[PDB]
Write an enzyme that holds these catalytic residues in place. Sequence first.
Site, PDB file in Angstrom:
ATOM      1  N   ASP A  93       8.140  10.852  24.653  1.00 19.37           N
ATOM      2  CA  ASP A  93       8.035  12.066  23.885  1.00 19.37           C
ATOM      3  C   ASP A  93       7.780  13.307  24.833  1.00 19.37           C
ATOM      4  O   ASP A  93       6.888  13.328  25.350  1.00 19.37           O
ATOM      5  CB  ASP A  93       7.059  11.933  22.683  1.00 19.37           C
ATOM      6  CG  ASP A  93       6.725  12.893  21.864  1.00 19.37           C
ATOM      7  OD1 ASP A  93       7.828  13.033  21.025  1.00 19.37           O
ATOM      8  OD2 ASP A  93       5.839  13.773  21.784  1.00 19.37           O
ATOM      9  N   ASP A 139       4.612  -0.934   7.432  1.00 17.62           N
ATOM     10  CA  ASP A 139       3.719  -1.262   8.111  1.00 17.62           C
ATOM     11  C   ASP A 139       4.479  -2.471   9.312  1.00 17.62           C
ATOM     12  O   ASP A 139       5.784  -2.448   8.955  1.00 17.62           O
ATOM     13  CB  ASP A 139       2.771  -2.164   7.297  1.00 17.62           C
ATOM     14  CG  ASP A 139       3.364  -2.804   6.117  1.00 17.62           C
ATOM     15  OD1 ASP A 139       4.282  -3.676   6.183  1.00 17.62           O
ATOM     16  OD2 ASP A 139       2.807  -2.448   5.034  1.00 17.62           O
ATOM     17  N   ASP A 159       7.090   4.124  21.848  1.00 19.76           N
ATOM     18  CA  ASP A 159       7.015   5.717  21.894  1.00 19.76           C
ATOM     19  C   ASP A 159       5.788   6.042  22.798  1.00 19.76           C
ATOM     20  O   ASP A 159       4.551   5.868  22.431  1.00 19.76           O
ATOM     21  CB  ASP A 159       6.942   6.073  20.624  1.00 19.76           C
ATOM     22  CG  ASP A 159       7.749   7.768  20.571  1.00 19.76           C
ATOM     23  OD1 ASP A 159       7.679   8.456  21.727  1.00 19.76           O
ATOM     24  OD2 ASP A 159       8.567   7.576  19.675  1.00 19.76           O
ATOM     25  N   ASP A 179       0.787  -1.230   0.071  1.00 17.91           N
ATOM     26  CA  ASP A 179      -0.070   0.114  -0.095  1.00 17.91           C
ATOM     27  C   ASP A 179       0.949   1.394   0.096  1.00 17.91           C
ATOM     28  O   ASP A 179       0.279   2.389   0.091  1.00 17.91           O
ATOM     29  CB  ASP A 179      -0.883   0.184   1.103  1.00 17.91           C
ATOM     30  CG  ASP A 179      -0.241  -0.029   2.618  1.00 17.91           C
ATOM     31  OD1 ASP A 179       0.887  -0.147   2.635  1.00 17.91           O
ATOM     32  OD2 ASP A 179      -0.888  -0.088   3.404  1.00 17.91           O
ATOM     33  N   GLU A 236      12.627  11.765  26.130  1.00 15.09           N
ATOM     34  CA  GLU A 236      12.928  12.916  25.338  1.00 15.09           C
ATOM     35  C   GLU A 236      12.912  14.048  25.968  1.00 15.09           C
ATOM     36  O   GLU A 236      11.780  14.481  26.292  1.00 15.09           O
ATOM     37  CB  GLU A 236      12.060  12.878  24.110  1.00 15.09           C
ATOM     38  CG  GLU A 236      12.631  14.000  22.837  1.00 15.09           C
ATOM     39  CD  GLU A 236      11.569  14.430  21.867  1.00 15.09           C
ATOM     40  OE1 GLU A 236      10.642  14.035  21.846  1.00 15.09           O
ATOM     41  OE2 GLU A 236      11.912  15.127  20.994  1.00 15.09           O
ATOM     42  N   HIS A 286      13.888  10.767  13.917  1.00 10.56           N
ATOM     43  CA  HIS A 286      13.106  11.320  13.029  1.00 10.56           C
ATOM     44  C   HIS A 286      12.781  12.621  13.122  1.00 10.56           C
ATOM     45  O   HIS A 286      11.995  13.301  12.544  1.00 10.56           O
ATOM     46  CB  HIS A 286      11.876  10.467  13.409  1.00 10.56           C
ATOM     47  CG  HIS A 286      10.995  10.696  14.672  1.00 10.56           C
ATOM     48  ND1 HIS A 286      11.783  10.483  15.853  1.00 10.56           N
ATOM     49  CD2 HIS A 286       9.825  11.255  15.028  1.00 10.56           C
ATOM     50  CE1 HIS A 286      10.996  10.931  16.799  1.00 10.56           C
ATOM     51  NE2 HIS A 286       9.924  11.548  16.328  1.00 10.56           N
ATOM     52  N   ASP A 287      13.416  13.305  14.165  1.00  4.62           N
ATOM     53  CA  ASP A 287      13.242  14.772  14.308  1.00  4.62           C
ATOM     54  C   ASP A 287      14.550  15.642  13.988  1.00  4.62           C
ATOM     55  O   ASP A 287      14.620  16.888  13.786  1.00  4.62           O
ATOM     56  CB  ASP A 287      12.945  15.148  15.724  1.00  4.62           C
ATOM     57  CG  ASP A 287      11.742  14.611  16.385  1.00  4.62           C
ATOM     58  OD1 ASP A 287      10.549  14.802  15.479  1.00  4.62           O
ATOM     59  OD2 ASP A 287      11.893  14.354  17.434  1.00  4.62           O
TER      60      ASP A 287
HETATM   61  O1  GLO Z   1      10.995  19.938  16.328  1.00  2.02           O
HETATM   62  C1  GLO Z   1      10.907  18.999  16.767  1.00  2.02           C
HETATM   63  C2  GLO Z   1       9.688  18.365  17.458  1.00  2.02           C
HETATM   64  O2  GLO Z   1       9.124  19.418  17.918  1.00  2.02           O
HETATM   65  C3  GLO Z   1       9.615  17.005  18.108  1.00  2.02           C
HETATM   66  O3  GLO Z   1      10.679  17.045  19.144  1.00  2.02           O
HETATM   67  C4  GLO Z   1       8.325  16.587  18.955  1.00  2.02           C
HETATM   68  O4  GLO Z   1       8.435  15.715  20.027  1.00  2.02           O
HETATM   69  C5  GLO Z   1       7.030  16.043  18.095  1.00  2.02           C
HETATM   70  O5  GLO Z   1       6.361  16.795  17.453  1.00  2.02           O
HETATM   71  C6  GLO Z   1       6.190  15.154  18.668  1.00  2.02           C
HETATM   72  O6  GLO Z   1       5.098  15.488  19.458  1.00  2.02           O
END
Ligand code: GLO
Length: 555
Positions: free
Chosen positions: A197, A26, A95, A22, A250, A326-327
């Site tokens: 998070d 996944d 997470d 898709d 985090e 991923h950030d």
């Molecule tokens: O710029 C980085 C983001 O602000 C990130 O650290 C947040 O954790 C994310 O959007 C999840 O809420």
Amino acid sequence: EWWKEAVVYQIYPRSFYDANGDGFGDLQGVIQKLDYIKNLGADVIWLSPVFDSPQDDNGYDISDYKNMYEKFGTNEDMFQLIDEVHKRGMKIVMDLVVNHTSDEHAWFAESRKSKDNPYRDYYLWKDPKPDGSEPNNWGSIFSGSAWTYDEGTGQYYLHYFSKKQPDLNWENEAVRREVYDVMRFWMDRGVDGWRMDVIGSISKYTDFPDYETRSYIVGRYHSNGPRLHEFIQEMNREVLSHYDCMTVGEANGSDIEEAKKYTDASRQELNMIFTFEHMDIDKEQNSPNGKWQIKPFDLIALKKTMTRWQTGLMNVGWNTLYFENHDQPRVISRWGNDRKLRKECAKAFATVLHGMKGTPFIYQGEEIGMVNSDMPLEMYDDLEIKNAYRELVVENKTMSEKEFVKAVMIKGRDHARTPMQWDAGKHAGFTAGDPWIPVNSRYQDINVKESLEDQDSIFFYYQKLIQLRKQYKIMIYGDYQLLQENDPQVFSYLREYRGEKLLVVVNLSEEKALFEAPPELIHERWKVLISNYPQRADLKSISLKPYEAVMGISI
Ligand SMILES: O=C[C@H](O)[C@@H](O)[C@H](O)[C@H](O)CO
């Protein structure tokens, strides 16, 4: 304390592997790639959030904590991912996103209905100011006000992030019991731990005081609230202490002192935290353009920052080691060379990180040297960018368009979200359909298949770094000491443990550099453990080639 000796692989599952066809990564795709992760050597996987979500922020806006989003699969797939991970002697870290929920969560749908609704206080509502404006001048991390008005109840609700991510009210005991029920549910079903998070935000200054003064401000009230650690301590007491688990926070807004509060074993909070301080080295301290006001890579600043963290938690608490997630963009594109010297540079940065004390984190694709995308601005997906474009370029005009584009091409989160590159075929073998976002145009020369074929690959270099960590306890338990600290090219340091020494020398520049060991190490004899070039093991004087990395152990 298995988590001290772990190497963690971070999966961003919507961009890892599409098993179902898709165009969307996944859970079955993840299961198919467990063998590959084990082969790399990671023994813990942290999975970005796969819970139900309208995907305003790609999983981090959750509408149901106890079911999967449809596109990842069902709960039967998740429980299977858990068993398949355990089968291979690995651990799985989910997470935990509990600073906020999606505005489409059942709790918020009731909460917004009226002031007398049972769920009203699950969230943070405040009256307008007399003149109708927002209760204070607090901004969203994703641009504009941290407050959104509800015409139906005449009150604003708080959101540190998107309008579709209303912050939870941790002052409410009901809300905390709800979070602990969620944690219990998943840990009873085999989740081995949590990555939490923006855990630094869960406690608010309940008086919502303005900042001094242009229009909306993000600052010190957005993290490290007066009850932050109280809440975490309760979380530990009520939940974490009932399971053999691992926790990584985090920790937005964290400095070394705060890190000790989070991680000191005696405080019974968390095991480790991510900081942003080493990530903040390439932005101006306080500009209205935030992270998008970019500074060139400064090696000295990197050394200063990381070293402060190595010495700060050297004998108390524990460090996390990361350059990617991923950030964040791809570290080699951001701060180094991703063309001719791509492999050397990737290996350099890996060696710098993995030779340190703490738990390493490998972000999917880091291990093959994935790079930043040359995609046009209109192809980015991240709400953060569109929001910043609107605020910084269109409205406030604190960045020209050209400057905003340069900045996104360096630091846009989407550089980490283009699909994982598995071979040189269509969509780099990520999907047999149409990917949710296009694959990086360079995938033909950068992928798993070509990496597993090339003995000189970044993949084998990572594999070897992980092997060495399991073989040499000095890498896990040694102390740390910066060397030649003023050198503008070379990042060198020493680890010591039980009479043994581990010397790491990495040239993080494109020019030749000279390492000279300090006088007291001149007569050590060394065995080279790894290097990104062919290497005498005579390290009192090393003429370093571009991006040359050497790690040596005393004999
Ligand atoms: O710029 C980085 C983001 O602000 C990130 O650290 C947040 O954790 C994310 O959007 C999840 O809420």
